[PDB]
Each structure stands twice: as structure tokens, then as C-alpha cells.
Amino acid sequence: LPTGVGYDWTGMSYQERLSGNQAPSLYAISLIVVFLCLAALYESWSIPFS
Amino acid sequence: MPNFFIDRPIFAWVIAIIIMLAGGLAILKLPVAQYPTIAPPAVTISASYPGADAKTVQDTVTQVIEQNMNGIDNLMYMSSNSDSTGTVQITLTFESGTDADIAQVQVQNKLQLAMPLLPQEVQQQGVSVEKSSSSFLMVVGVINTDGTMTQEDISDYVAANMKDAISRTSGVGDVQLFGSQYAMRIWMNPNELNKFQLTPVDVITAIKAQNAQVAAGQLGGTPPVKGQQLNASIIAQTRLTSTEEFGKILLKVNQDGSRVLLRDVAKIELGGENYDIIAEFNGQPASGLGIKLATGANALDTAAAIRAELAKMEPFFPSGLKIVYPYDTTPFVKISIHEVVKTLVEAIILVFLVMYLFLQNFRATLIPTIAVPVVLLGTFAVLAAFGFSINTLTMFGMVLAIGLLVDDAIVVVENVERVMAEEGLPPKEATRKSMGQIQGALVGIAMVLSAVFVPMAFFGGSTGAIYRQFSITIVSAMALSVLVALILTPALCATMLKPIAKGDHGEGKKGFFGWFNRMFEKSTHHYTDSVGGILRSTGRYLVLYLIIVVGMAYLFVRLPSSFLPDEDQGVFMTMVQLPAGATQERTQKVLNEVTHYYLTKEKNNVESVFAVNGFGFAGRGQNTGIAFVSLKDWADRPGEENKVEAITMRATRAFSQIKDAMVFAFNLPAIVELGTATGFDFELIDQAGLGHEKLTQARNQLLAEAAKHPDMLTSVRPNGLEDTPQFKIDIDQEKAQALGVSINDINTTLGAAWGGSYVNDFIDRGRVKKVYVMSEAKYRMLPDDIGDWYVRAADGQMVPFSAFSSSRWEYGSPRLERYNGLPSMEILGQAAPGKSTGEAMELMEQLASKLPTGVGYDWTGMSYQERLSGNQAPSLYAISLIVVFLCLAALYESWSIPFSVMLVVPLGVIGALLAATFRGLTNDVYFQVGLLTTIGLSAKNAILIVEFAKDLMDKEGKGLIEATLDAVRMRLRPILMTSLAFILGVMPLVISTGAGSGAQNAVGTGVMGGMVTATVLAIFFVPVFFVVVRRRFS
Amino acid sequence: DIAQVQVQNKLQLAMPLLPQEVQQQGVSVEKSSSSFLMVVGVINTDGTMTQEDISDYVAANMKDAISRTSGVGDVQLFGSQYAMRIWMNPNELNKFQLTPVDVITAIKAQNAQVAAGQLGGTPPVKGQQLNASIIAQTRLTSTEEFGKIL
Amino acid sequence: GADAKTVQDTVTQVIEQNMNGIDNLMYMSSNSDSTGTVQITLTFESGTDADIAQVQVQNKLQLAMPLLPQEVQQQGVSVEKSSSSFLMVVGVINTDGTMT
Amino acid sequence: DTAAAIRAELAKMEPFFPSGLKIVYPYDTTPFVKISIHEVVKTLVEAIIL
């Protein structure tokens, strides 16, 4: 479009964009948390990695 | 717990990783501000009644609003000012912890119901309720370097183009315009008005009639006919848009057929809504935006965003328009926080170096280098959890807690090291033995330091809010340090430390390290022998301890008290006060002299001067002014003579020679949200409707009586303006009726001509702007100009003001004050040197008790806080002392041994007091928190010494003297190395002289002195206390 | 607090439609118990003050501060504050061909405080040396000035 | 009686000027109608206390209220928690046909 | 607490009253509350003694 006209998402689309944006960080944090829990419980890094 | 995590090092590492991740998340998400919310929440009501004196505003606005300020929750007090400029300013102060949003909504809601009772002009101008408990994050000035734009033009441009985008910047909480939009000014000529048979009333009526918005209707609107096909909105008369349109307004058509327009009887232009205040930046016209930071926002990021937005704006500006920053204290905040962070990092590095010097082991040194940062990150996480921010108080509290953190890490690592070097056990078994030795002591120490530091969180008022930051920070740091010492440090010792031979303690090494080991062994032997000799003659050293306690009490009573050190923030202020009746031009001349002096005699130090003519502090008028002087960067102002204190002293000395003006230069308070010192704010209330004159007489009597006590009260002065001449127009309404002149017309003519009248709005370039009608300046200057104004009568003949009104000169107040809804006068003072604030307050109460009947008094401001939180300290610390005794008795399973530990407080207190006294520092907040930290470290050392001694006495058959000597021998090294690390860490704070050096010196000098004397004295006084206690109570 | 906030937010929509007398008297929104926390009476032992004098003293010197005390939800004055009372005589109004409308207009015109402006007010002319507030008609303060209203 | 442009410049712009700086504000959308009506919906972050947000919006709206036309003030500027979806529609008819 | 605050405010007012003016408390249930709670506390102490 011409210069000076931008866009944005509002309402349902805003929430959809937020969910999509924050999904990968959620996955990374959950994987890290599970890895740390396994390392704490089984007293190892090999078992968490496997 | 220590044994659990020695077999599970990975679980300890997982806990540490969780703590570090939480701390990092907090650091990324924490707010940053110079100070937290310290002032009690306050809500301020502002109204304007143009052209009105103080009494008119007070009787028509102030009292009406004050009589409706009922049913508002958590209100400490209320005060109000009514100024001769026509403005009422009412401040309602609520208790700390009150929800500022709820207080503001309640205040405005009670005012919305009071609104119908106010004059229509006040309603038209609007009454605004705001939060005055906060200050400006930044001031962005806009100047014109070509002279093509006046102050009004710059203000209008800033309003139209800059205010919106600045307000939309992230983190910006509020934007106040230093100016106002354009206003359609109608400058009336009384001669032309009389020539064309007109008055100001006619001008206002014509403007209202011919400049309005009319609701027209709609074509084919519902309910329509059964065959309508077109529906359109009808547009009709709309507001005017240009000065030419206003000039064409028709006032009357003469009999001969001539047309009288508005331009015929007046000049039409685009001026300002108000002309009371003129802002200049280095002598050039200037406008500005005052930006307040939003709640929970990062001050540094917000300032950076504001600057980025301004830089984006720069290209589109009209030629000659420039952006300046007269009040930029953000650099001070940045440098202060950076200095604190550098202090923390250098403290960690020095801990590493001292650990390597004393233990000569790389992994042992690494262990604290891991432990301490974990505790710091956890402390950041804890601050974020409880809704705290990164500010000066919290960061200095962290600096203070570094001592305890490093002490814990050093204690654990050094004890494991010593067990390895003595018993020859491997790292795991040695760590088990060490933690079995010291874990109960660590837990008891955590409890004791909790008892020591928690009570500060329960102080009341602004001082209590200040102390709560340190309390929470240090308590969280200490708790996390203890948890780390119980969880991670044992695991790190068990997994990282290498084995050491049974008999190896560095003697066989060569070089500097071998020499140091031999010297330390010899010093330990000498110290052990000296302690053994001391224990044979404990009575002499008990007498010496009594001497130390007496000296401590003497120094404490002789040490002056304060709140916060005054800082060189790169800016300061200069107030100009001219005599009563001085006009804007005289104040402008004086401010020009001040600006010339600052830009010539201090050109090497001053970067710019922002002179505001029209309002100073504690008043606003043509005779008052304020200049905000900005200094160059500290790197460009080296030496004591080039700092704010010296510059202000020199400027005041230079300005003392200015005649017919009081010009006084001074520095900002530590927290600008409070104007506070070692002084008192006192209110003298008219409790029986005596009147203004009797209240003035009572105030004068009180001032004389206070001046008759120079040894206790200093500079007791009123915080207000004296009565000034006023011009009274006494209208004889009988003559007006006889001449057929309506008194309403007379009053409207007088007010519109001399006071100015707001008529209605108009749409300029798509923005609503006010329309003002006022007399042209030439005809409303002097009393004689009153004769130039005529008013039509019922007969149609003009009558002069002299025909139905007389004039004279009287005396009246240019500023009327009320406290708690009653007339009042404010008196500021301070206790004389060597006298406490409480004594000055008591003397002022005694002097007030001898005042005329019907005159009461009250304490407001900091005096109110003093009167509430007066005796709370000693009780809070008697509770703390009792809880410490109980915790120590639990730890040692003895009702008497706790005293041997508790008797160590004076050893550090005396050193802190001596260091403060020699350097001349005061008993301020930073000194007190450093004193508490020194007491905590000394108590920790004494607790460990007594624990070792009692363990030797009980778990082994060793005697009292033998156990004490062995305990002190074992504990000498960790004590000395921790003290060395902390002292070297605080050297930069002690020696600092740059930005933020006031707080740095206040924190560092007391810590240095207390730590030095605690380390020196405790190492041979704690054994004496333990031996004496065990002998007397066994 | 929120209940009162919402109630007042709805009431400020109706306020413009209420009669001007109701607005001038003052619409109030309280959040208080329906029963008195206490009753603070005021008497005169010497007997030198009438009930009206005591009521006026309580209203003018005691009621407002008590209403501002925290926790006080509502205050009911067992009496009333003083006001300047004009007891009209219809026979004398008819004698001079006057009505209560004329009396009210005269009171409004001759008992007022007017913003009269300033000497040397801003924007001033160059060389202006004097700045003073102009004082004009002030509100009457006694029961002798109202009696002199023409 | 004011078109969309005039009411926008006189009301909507003035009101939305002061709406910046309110806590937890995701965004805001306003519309100005030819009948002089103005709506300004401020959508806050999920989990925000709606009552506190309404109180803050009222506090910021006071700073603009006196700057609006007197006709607006006579009609009244309302601030209230809003929803954009109908929970239900309850219709009413007459089965006799007697009522219009 | 509100009754205590009211009494404190009245105490602040009294010094400036006209001659003969006096404050009385024709209706106040707070004394009943004080004596009731005190009586229950007394019964507790006597119960411990018994």
C-alpha cells in the first residue's frame, strides 16, 4: 500500500497474533522446566538428555 | 539439608539455575526509578477564577469546595491557597498505603456535586483534580533561535504537534504543557467603544451570538413519509475558524447605514490564554513539556523513548525551532545506578582476590564467585515478586547486604578448607563435618538478622517507606544467602574442592604466598597468646568495655541527625522575589541579571538557565520568579569548587548585592517529592473566626516570641505573602439607579475590561480554542485609566465610572491560606544547631500556648510525621532485642550465653560513630542502615565464635579457657578475610567525590568505621564476654 | 468504594436534568450504616445561647471537621446553620408596589463578589511599574447591610 | 447536531488525548458519528481489574471534561465497563395484532 | 476507631468553645462494647485461675 498507511490486528486477531507469537517461548520454557525437574529428581544430566 | 545436597549436587545446581532464571526475568521486567513512592498520597484540586483577588476566590470557590470535602476515606489533612492571580489550590493528604486512584476518584466525585455551587466562570474554566504526590521525570523545552516565533507560538506548536506523540510514548504517564494553545484575543479600545455607542457587554453578546454551534436536523429523518428516498444530515451555523471571521462580527448598524464590526472597536489576534508566566531559555522565548513517568515503568527506558520520539520529530520542525532539556536528572540516576552496580561487581572481584590470598586455591575462590551472584539474582526475583523496583534505596541496600553475603560464602568455604587442612579428610567428608559444625549457627544467624532488620519495615510515614526498601532488600538477601549456604555452597565444596594433606597449611610454599602463610601463622599464634593473657584479667577489659559504651553514648548524642545526603545532580534552582507591587518587567530584569551572571561568571559550569517569570515557590505573581540552572557534565566540572554546593554559595554571594530583590540560589532536596530538612512546618489556625487581621497580629506575636529564642529556634519565618496595597472601587448603586445604569453592566464592564472574560470556543485548525475579551493593555494600567471606561444607561446615554463610583487604596492579602478548612498561616522553622527537632516543636507549642484567645495551632508536613512516629523506634528495637535474645537462647540452649553474643553491638557502633564524626557526616538513613549491617556482621562473627567454643566445651572435654582459645584461633581467619573484603569493597564509596557521592559517602564511611572497629575489638572482646558469662553463670 | 463510584457515575448523568434548586442545595451520595454510631449533643450551661445559636456554632465550627474524620459515613445536624433570613411583609411589598421577585433581584445584584481585574495586569505595557488587584463589590457580612439594600 | 469531523475535533480528540498512561491498556478504538455521538473503547490487558481501570479512566477523563462543549456536559459523558457482544435478545410481540 | 477519632477531634475543638458551651453524649453504645469485652476477658482470666 502507499507510504504512510500501516495496519494492525484488533480483537480476535490480536489474541490470535499474541498466541502465535508466544507459543515458541512457551514450548522452550516448558521443555527447560521438564529437563530441570528430571535432572533434580534423577540426579543426572544423562537421564534428562535421553 | 546440607547433608542432603552434598549427595545431590545436581539438585543443588538445578535450584541455583531456577534462582538465576527467576532473577534474570525479574531484572528484565523490574521497574527502574530514582526513588520509590515515599510521600503520602495527595490529591490536588486546582481552579481558576480570572480577574479575581484572593478574598473573592476564597469566599466564592475555596470555602465552597472545602465545605464539601466530606466522606473521603483515609484523609490525614487538607490545606488550601487562594491567590490574587485568581487561582485556588487545595491539597488533600491521605495516610500512607491509601490507594491514590481511589482517593482521587472520591475527591473528584465530591467536587462534581460541589460544582453547581461555584461561580459560572469557575465552572467554565474547569476544576481539575490531579495527583500532586509525584514529580516530573523530564522537562523538554522548545526554543526559537531566530526570533520569528514568540512564546505563544512555540506553546501552540508544542500543543498541536508534540504533546500527543510524547504522551503516546511508552512509559510516559503524564504530560503537562508549559503554556497553552492559541486563544482568540479581543483587545477592546474604550475610546472606540464609546465612539460607536457600545460597551464590553455588547461585544460579549455579539461574540456569543455569532460564534456558536447550532443543531439543525436531518433531511428525510425518521419518522419519514411513505416514499422518501433521500436521507441527509443538515449542517448549519458552525464555530468560526479565523481571526478575519471574528473581525467581521457585527455589533451594530448605525442609523445612517454604516456597519460597526468587531474590528472597529477592538483588535483581534491569536494570543495566549494567560500571560502571567513568561519562560525563557538562556534569554530566548521558550515553551516546554513536563513529563511524569508512568507507574511501573522504567525511567531510563522511558527517557530514551522520549528522546527518540523528539529526534524523530526534529526534521518536521519549523526553521529555527530547537529542543533542549533544562531539567534532565536522568543522567544522575544512570550514573548512580551504574556506580552501585560497579561497586557490586568490584566487591565480588575483591572477594575472589581475598579468597585466593588467604586460601591460595582457585576452586575455593570460584565457589563464592558462583554463590554470591546467585543470591543477588534471587534477591532481584524477590524484589520483583513483592512489587518493588530498582531504585537508589534498594540498590544501596544490596550494596550493604554484600557484606553479609560474602561473609556467609567465606564462612562456609573457609570452614571446609580448614577442616580439610587439619583433619586431612577428603572434600566430601570434610564438607559434611564442616556443615555439621556450622549449620545450626547459620540458621540461628538467619533468625537473628531477621530480628535485627525486619523492624525497619514497620516504621510509619515517609521515613518508614524509605526504611522499608532497605528492610525488604537486606532481609531477602540474607535469607537467600542462608538458603544458598545450606543448599549450594556445600555441594560446590564437595564437588569442586581438591583434597589437602593432613598437616599442610601453606608453610612449605615459597615466595610471597609462603611468606604470607608464615606471617599469618605467626600472627595467629601471637593473637592466641594475647587473648590467653587477656582472659586472665577480664576485669580491666570489662572496665574498658564500659568506657567504650560511655564513649559510644557520648558520640551518639553529639551526632547530628538528618534524612538523606544532598546530591550534586547537575541542576539547581534560584528563586527571585521582588517587593510587593512589582510588575512583570522588573522581575524580568532581575531574572536577566541572574541569567547573565550564570552564563558569564559560571560559563565553565553552567550549560543553560531556564528563567520563569511569573511563579516562584510558595506563590505565583508578577513579583516572583524561578530559574532552573542546568550544569555541565560532572567530567567537565572537576574539583569541589565546581560542584553544586560551591556554585550555589558563590551565586548567592553574588546576588546578595542585587537591590530591591531577594535572589537566593539553592540545591534540590534528596527527594524533591518532599521538601524536608531538620526543621518544622507549623500551622497557626483561626479557631474562632477572628479574621485575617487578628490572625496576622497573632502570627507577628508568635514570630517575635520565637525570635526571642535564638538558642533553640532558627529562621522562623512565615510561608506566605504580606498584605499589599489594593485598589478599591466603591460603587454607589443609588447613583447607578438614578442614572439608569444596571449594576450588572457596571460589574461586567469592569471585569471584562480589567480582568478579562472568557466568552466561548472556536475551531482553529481542527482544535477547540478559547475566545477571550479584555481591554487593550494601554487602557487598563493605572487608576486614572478607570476614567476612560463608560457604560450605557437605560436612557442610552453613556455614564463614566467616576459618575457613579469612587476609588481609594486599601490593604489586602495577595494569598489567603486555610488549613483543615479554617483560616491559617504557615510558619517554617528549624531547630538551632545542637537541638533536636522535637525540642523546637515543644518550644513552638509552648510559645503558641501564650497566643490570643481563639488562635490554635497544628503540625503539618514533616512535623506531622514526627508527631506520629516519635517513640516507635525504641519500642521496635526493644522488640528486636528481645527476639534476638530468644533466638540466641534457643540456639545455645542457655539463658545466659546469649549475652556474650549480644554484648558486641557497641564494638561496631563506636567505630561507625567515630568514622561519621571525623568525616562530619550526620545520623541519616544510610548511616543507620550501615550501622545495622555492621551490627549484624559483628553478631554473626560472635555467634560463630561462641558456637565453636561451646561445641568444644560440650561435645569434647576441653575446658572453658582452652575451648575459648581454640575457638578464637579457628575463627580468626574467616573474620579477618571477610572484614578485609568488605572494607576494600567499600573503599570506593568512602573516597568517591563525583555524581552521587553524598549517598555513597554516607553509606561507606559508617560501614568502614564500624567494620574496622568491630573486627579489631570483637576478636578479643567476644572471648572475654563468653568466659565471663560462663564463669558467672556456671 | 466501587459501589459508590458506580452510583455516582450514574447519578452525574441525571444531575443536569434535576431542577436547579435541587442542584444548588447539593445532592449527596453516602456509604454509611443506617443507624447512628453516636450522638454528640451540645448544650450551654450558662444558658446564654439559644438552641439556634448552639446549632449554628455546631454547624460552623464542629460539623465540617467531624464529617472529614475518617470512618464517619454521614453526619446529621440536629438543628441548622445560620443564614441571612429575609422575612418579607406582603403588605409593605404591596405598599411600595414590589414583589419577592424584586427582592430576590436586589439581593442578587447588591450582595455579590465580582472579579474586578488588576492594575497593571498582564499583558502589561512597557515601563509598567505598579501591579495591584482591583477590589470591588464584596459580599455583605451583617444584618445591617442587607437592610440597607436598595 | 455536530457532524463527525467537528465532534471528533471537539470531543474525541480531546478525550483520547488524556487516555495515554493508564495502566495495562492494550489499545483503544474510538468512533465519531454524524449525530454527534462519540464512543471510545479502551481495551486493557487480560487479568486487569476492570473496576480499577474504570476508576483510572474516570480520573483521566476529568482532565478533559471541562474542555468539552457545554451541550456535551449537559447531556453527560459516561465512563463504564463495556461489552461488544449481546448475551441475549429478548423480543416482545403481540399475538393479537392490536399493538403497533 | 471512628469514635476515638471523633472524641479526639472534639477534644481539639473544646479549648476554643464559647463560655458555657459543653459537649455531652446522649447516645453512645461504645461503652457497652468496652465493658462487655472487658467482662469476657475477666472471665477468661478467672477461668485460668480456677
Ligand SMILES: NC1CCN(C[C@@H](O)COc2cccc(C(F)(F)F)c2)CC1
Ligand atoms: N502557563 C505555563 C507557562 C510556562 N510555565 C512553565 C513553568 O512551570 C516551567 O518551569 C518548570 C520547569 C521544571 C520544573 C518545574 C516544577 F517546579 F513544576 F516541577 C517547573 C508554567 C505555566
